[PDB]
Amino acid sequence: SDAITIRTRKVISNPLLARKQFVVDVLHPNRANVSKDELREKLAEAYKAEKDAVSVFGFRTQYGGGKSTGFGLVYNSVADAKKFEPAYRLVRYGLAEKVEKASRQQRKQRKNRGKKIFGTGKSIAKKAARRNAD
Amino acid sequence: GKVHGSLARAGKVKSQTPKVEKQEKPKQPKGRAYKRLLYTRRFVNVTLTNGKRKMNPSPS
Amino acid sequence: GKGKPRGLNSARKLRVHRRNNRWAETTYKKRLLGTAFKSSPFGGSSHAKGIVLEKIGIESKQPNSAIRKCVRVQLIKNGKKVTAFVPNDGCLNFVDENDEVLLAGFGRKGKAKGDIPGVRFKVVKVSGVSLLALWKEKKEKPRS
Amino acid sequence: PRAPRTYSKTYSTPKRPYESARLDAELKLAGEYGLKNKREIYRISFQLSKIRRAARDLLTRDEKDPKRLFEGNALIRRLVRIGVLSEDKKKLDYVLALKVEDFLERRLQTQVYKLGLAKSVHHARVLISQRHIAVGKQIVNIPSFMVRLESEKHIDFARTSPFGGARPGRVARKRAAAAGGE
RNA sequence: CAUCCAAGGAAGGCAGCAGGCGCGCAAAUUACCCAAUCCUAAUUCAGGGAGGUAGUGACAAUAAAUAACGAUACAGGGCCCAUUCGGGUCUUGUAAUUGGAAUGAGUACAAUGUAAAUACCUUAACGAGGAACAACUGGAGGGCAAGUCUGGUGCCAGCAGCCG
Ligand SMILES: [Mg+2]
Ligand SMILES: [Mg+2]
Ligand SMILES: [Mg+2]
Ligand SMILES: [Mg+2]
Ligand SMILES: [Mg+2]
Ligand SMILES: [Mg+2]
Ligand SMILES: [Mg+2]
Ligand SMILES: [Mg+2]
Ligand SMILES: [Mg+2]
Numbered sequence: 125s126d127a128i129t130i131r132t133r134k135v136i137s138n139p140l141l142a143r144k145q146f147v148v149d150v151l152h153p154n155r156a157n158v159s160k161d162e163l164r165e166k167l168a169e170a171y172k173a174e175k176d177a178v179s180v181f182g183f184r185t186q187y188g189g190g191k192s193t194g195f196g197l198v199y200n201s202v203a204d205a206k207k208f209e210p211a212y213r214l215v216r217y218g219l220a221e222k223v224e225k226a227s228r229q230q231r232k233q234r235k236n237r238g239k240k241i242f243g244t245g246k247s248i249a250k251k252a253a254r255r256n257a258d
Numbered sequence: 259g260k261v262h263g264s265l266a267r268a269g270k271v272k273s274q275t276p277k278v279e280k281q282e283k284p285k286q287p288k289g290r291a292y293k294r295l296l297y298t299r300r301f302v303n304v305t306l307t308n309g310k311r312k313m314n315p316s317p318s
Numbered sequence: 319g320k321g322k323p324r325g326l327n328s329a330r331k332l333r334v335h336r337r338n339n340r341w342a343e344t345t346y347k348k349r350l351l352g353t354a355f356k357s358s359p360f361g362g363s364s365h366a367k368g369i370v371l372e373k374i375g376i377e378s379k380q381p382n383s384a385i386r387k388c389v390r391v392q393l394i395k396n397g398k399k400v401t402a403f404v405p406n407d408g409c410l411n412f413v414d415e416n417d418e419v420l421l422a423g424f425g426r427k428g429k430a431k432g433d434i435p436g437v438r439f440k441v442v443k444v445s446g447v448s449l450l451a452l453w454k455e456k457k458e459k460p461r462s
Numbered sequence: 463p464r465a466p467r468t469y470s471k472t473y474s475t476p477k478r479p480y481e482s483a484r485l486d487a488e489l490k491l492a493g494e495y496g497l498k499n500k501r502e503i504y505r506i507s508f509q510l511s512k513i514r515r516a517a518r519d520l521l522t523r524d525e526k527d528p529k530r531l532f533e534g535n536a537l538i539r540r541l542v543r544i545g546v547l548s549e550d551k552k553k554l555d556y557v558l559a560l561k562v563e564d565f566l567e568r569r570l571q572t573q574v575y576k577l578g579l580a581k582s583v584h585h586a587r588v589l590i591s592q593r594h595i596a597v598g599k600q601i602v603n604i605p606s607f608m609v610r611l612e613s614e615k616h617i618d619f620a621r622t623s624p625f626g627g628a629r630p631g632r633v634a635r636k637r638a639a640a641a642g643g644e
Numbered sequence: 645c646a647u648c649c650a651a652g653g654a655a656g657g658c659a660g661c662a663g664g665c666g667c668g669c670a671a672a673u674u675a676c677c678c679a680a681u682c683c684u685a686a687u688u689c690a691g692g693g694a695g696g697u698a699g700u701g702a703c704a705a706u707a708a709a710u711a712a713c714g715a716u717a718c719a720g721g722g723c724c725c726a727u728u729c730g731g732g733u734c735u736u737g738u739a740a741u742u743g744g745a746a747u748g749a750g751u752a753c754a755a756u757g758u759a760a761a762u763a764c765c766u767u768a769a770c771g772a773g774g775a776a777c778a779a780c781u782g783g784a785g786g787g788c789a790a791g792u793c794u795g796g797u798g799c800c801a802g803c804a805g806c807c808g
Contacts, residue, residue, distance in 0.1 A: 152766095153621065154622075154628075155766090155767085156754075156755060156756080156766050156767040156768080157754090157755045157756040157757095157765090157766055157767080158755080158756080159754085159755050159756080160755080160756075162755095181757095182757090183755095183756050183757075184756080184757080184765065184766095185755090185756065185765055185766040185767090186600075186765070186766085187600070187601070187765060187766090188593070188596065188600055188601040188620065188622070188765090188766085189622060189765085189766050189767075190599070190622075190766090192756080192765090192766080194756090210679075210759085211679095211759085212679065212758090212759050212760085215759090215760095222760095227676090228676075228677065228678090235691095261800080263800095265800060265801095266375065266385055266800080266801095267800090267801085268387050268407075268408060268409075268410035268411055268801080268802095269407055269408025269409075269410065269411055269801075269802095270797080270800065270801045270802090271407060271796075271797050271798095271800080271801040271802065272407045272408040272801075272802090273408065273801090274796075274797075274801095275795090275796050275797075276795070276796060278795080278796095284740075284774075285710095285774070285775090285776090285778055286778095286779095287710080287711070288710055288711095288778095288779055288780090289498055289709075289710055289711085289779090290496055290497070290498040290584065290587060290709095290710090290711085291584075291710080291711065291712090293489070293492045293493060293496075293497065293498065293499075294493055294496065294584060296489060296493070297489055297490070297492060297493020297494075298493070298736095298737070299737095300486075300489065301486075301489070301490060301493065302736070302737075303720085303736080303737055303738090313789085313790060313791095314784080314790060314791055314793095315791080315793095316791050316792075316793045317793060318792095318793075360669095363668095363669070363670095364669065364670095365669040365670085366668090366669065367668080367669070381799095381808080382799080382804095382808090383799045383800090384799070384800070384801080384802070385800090386802085387802095394668085395667090395668065395669095406802080406803095407801065407802055407803090408801090408802095420669070422669090424805095425805050426805065426806095427805095431804090431805070431806095432803090432804060432805090432806090432808095433804090443669095463694095463695095464681095464695090464696095468705095469704070469705035469706075470705070470706090471704095471705070471706095472705085472706070478788095479788085479789095480787095480788045480789060481788095481789090482788095482789065485789065498708075498709090499708095581713080582712080582713080584711090584712065585712060585713070587712085588711070588712045588713095588746080588747080589712085589746085591708085591709070591711095591747080591748085592712090592746055592747045592748075593747080593748085594746080594747090603707095603708090604707065604708075605707095605708080606707075606708090623746090624745090624746075625746090630745085630746090631745075631746060631747075632746080632747080632770090632771075632772095633744085633745060633746070633747095633772090634744090634745065634746090637744085637745095
């Protein structure tokens with residue numbers, strides 16, 4: 125009596141982005157939310173596409189449980205999904221990796237420190253070294 | 259004598275009143291229950307129809 | 319018919335007549351002259367802190383025989399000195415000499431209330447803590 | 463700097479706050495319909511006052527005037543859709559004749575009481591507040607859910623609730639577990 | 645009005661976001677990030693304390709928990725009449741009696757949410773008996789709803805917006 129059933133309302137094709145947009149209306153009694161990955165797979169064999177060219181987000185299990193609503197897109201190919209989707213969705217789905225970024229404060233500090241020096245820091249390092257030498 | 263102490267001393271009656279402790283009570287229901295209690299006590303359990311309602315009638 | 323003109327082109331004298339008559343009120347005159355900022359102990363201020371100079375009690379009027387426990391406070395914002403009232407029963411001892419006290423209005427539009435002569439300000443807080451919390455022993459004076 | 467969204471007051475305390483007859487009437491209406499505070503009666507009176515202000519403003523306008531026709535029948539249809547105004551008197555002059563008790567009657571509280579699935583008005587209040595009644599497979603934990611005429615037929619206990627058919631709940635499940643263990 | 649100073653010199657502009665001193669009755673965290681709105685640039689990609697997200701926040705504003713229902717003992721009204729009765733025949737309250745339910749406020753597997761996280765919506769597993777999971781703030785002479793009850797002080801202490 126689980127029977128998670130899925131529906132795609134307001135579906136619009138879109139070769140502008142080589143996608144198909146829709147709102148995901150998932151009816152699921154006696155159950156919590158649908159754990160996006162599982163619903164991505166459900167849409168994957170629903171629309172005859174791989175589990176990689178399918179994305180869902182913006183979900184909201186309505187008040188009182190049961191129904192839930194989100195937004196979903198199905199891309200014509202996995203490559204188009206790779207080259208059109210935001211980075212954070214490509215990180216959620218495991219098809220990309222979180223970029224090794226220093227924190228914003230450190231980046232700004234380093235930017236100002238680079239501001240202090242005109243041109244490359246090659247000459248100034250040796251100049252300062254031989255300066256404190258004497 | 260005429261006056262039992264220094265007359266103009268501040269906090270006199272407060273100082274010498276007998277400290278009587280609060281009497282412990284059952285919980286008084288609050289919210290909708292309190293309004294229901296008041297409605298029952300006044301308009302379906304009319305106690306003293308004579309004269310006025312006389313809520314809080316002194317015992318004499 | 320009446321004292322005021324009634325013609326369709328008499329807006330000017332009607333307006334200036336009202337404008338000259340408005341000074342007869344007290345609220346309008348105070349608001350426009352701005353006497354509150356210049357003369358009152360507080361300039362349009364509901365509350366003000368001050369320093370207790372000494373600790374006085376003031377006798378009441380004829381029909382009421384008692385001594386209301388006051389306190390002379392020099393205001394910190396400008397330096398004026400005003401008497402103020404310590405409201406409740408055992409609160410005189412709570413406020414000690416030379417501690418910061420937050421005086422408030424006395425509720426009668428800057429005029430003496432009841433039988434207390436020459437006072438126009440309550441006492442709400444002392445040394446950062448409120449008098450009502452001290453009087454019911456909810457908080458205690460920090461004694462700094 | 464973002465465009466604000468407008469909060470607005472929804473009640474108005476009476477100017478004479480201490481009227482014996484009015485206080486007794488307010489307590490009557492609070493006890494009859496299990497209202498938590500007397501702010502509920504103020505809110506219904508404020509809604510009724512807005513409705514009456516609109517009705518009187520439209521009445522002042524001349525008969526057969528586009529404003530009168532359009533917004534008068536709009537208000538009429540809205541009120542009959544709520545259900546407070548009976549279909550017999552869709553005239554915009556009986557709108558001025560509505561009483562606060564009329565809007566009080568259409569609350570989901572009193573409707574659950576009328577349907578009988580709650581045997582007491584306070585029982586209706588608690589049953590609504592415990593997420594049991596669902597107006598069309600959608601629970602409403604709010605007593606002041608103004609039930610409209612088109613949807614009153616769809617009040618019943620929700621499926622997730624034990625009354626609509628589900629697991630019983632904390633106390634019953636614990637008692638059953640204790641009985642099974644011992 | 646200030647800062648470093650090797651006393652020769654050098655460098656200043658928060659009524660930007662933070663934060664500090666002061667002032668005053670009076671007003672927030674040196675937080676996260678370009679996800680969203682957009683903007684700049686050679687221009688998708690870089691950048692943006694613009695901005696958004698959170699932190700504090702009883703400025704204001706909305707909805708709304710703090711119990712609900714029985715079965716018993718003390719009672720009251722419509723009563724079959726009125727042999728005193730009185731069954732309570734018909735109901736409505738009061739009792740530290742007494743039972744079974746329902747539920748959140750909290751915790752918390754998860755998943756949703758989000759740039760990432762909180763938080764909300766959903767939901768496992770716990771989570772109500774004095775349901776101590778305990779609602780306060782003012783007032784009870786009049787204005788103005790509610791005491792000419794008990795004790796204390798006796799024109800003191802104090803109350804009182806006004807009359808008192
Ligand atoms: Mg600043
Ligand atoms: Mg800003
Ligand atoms: Mg402030
Ligand atoms: Mg907080
Ligand atoms: Mg509580
Ligand atoms: Mg009290
Ligand atoms: Mg008092
Ligand atoms: Mg008293
Ligand atoms: Mg009265």
